[model samples]
Target: GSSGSSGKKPLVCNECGKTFRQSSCLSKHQRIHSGEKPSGPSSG
Candidate 1:
């Protein structure tokens, strides 16, 4: 990943603590983790 989202207030991930500018962005991040994935962590 990149730190491009550094400045804006981010939408915090409930799965992981990673934050995005919007839920649209956050949804993209969560897509990386499926039930089959090894292991990982969410927010609204």
Candidate 2:
């Protein structure tokens, strides 16, 4: 039998306290605090 392994601990945003599964994801989420939208087609 194979047991599922858990992922690493989530990274918390210092500014908003948002949690992400990875560091990169947390970094991208932090951009929102700067009023920068990095998701839309016209966003940076």
Candidate 3:
């Protein structure tokens, strides 16, 4: 098998279908829809 680490897979928002860098930051973007405002950084 090949070590696929080229970052070809993008993080897409299921709720909004918006493309993000990754899950670490995508989680925050999702909050904007459901009003899930947390007081802290992206706890990746």
Candidate with top TM-score is 2
| TM per prediction | 0.43, 0.48, 0.46
RMSD of 3: 7.0
Q: After superposition, how far is residue 27 of candidate 1 from its true place, in Å?
A: 0.6
Per-model tally of clashing residue pairs: 4, 0, 0
| lDDT for each candidate structure | 0.70, 0.78, 0.78
Regions of candidate 1 where Cα sits further than 4 Å from its true position: 1-10, 35-44
Candidate ordering by TM-score (highest first) = 2, 3, 1
User: Candidate 1 on 1-44: residue-level lDDT in tens?
Assistant: 78686585668777878878778888778877644544544331
Clash pairs (backbone) in predicted model 1: 14-42, 14-43, 15-41, 15-42
lDDT of 3 by residue, 1-44 (tens): 99988877788888989998767788888887766456567542
| Candidate closer to the true structure by lDDT (higher is better), 1 or 3 | 3
Per-residue lDDT of candidate 2, residues 1-44 (tens digit) = 65756675569999989878877899988877867555777655
lDDT of 3: 0.78
Each prediction's Cα RMSD? 10.8, 7.4, 7.0
Backbone clashes in model 2, listed as residue pairs: none
The residue pairs that clash in candidate 3, if any, are none
lDDT ranking, best first: 2, 3, 1
Give the residue spans of candidate 2 off by over 4 A: 1-9, 35-44
| C-alpha lDDT (0 to 100) for residue 31 of candidate 2 | 76
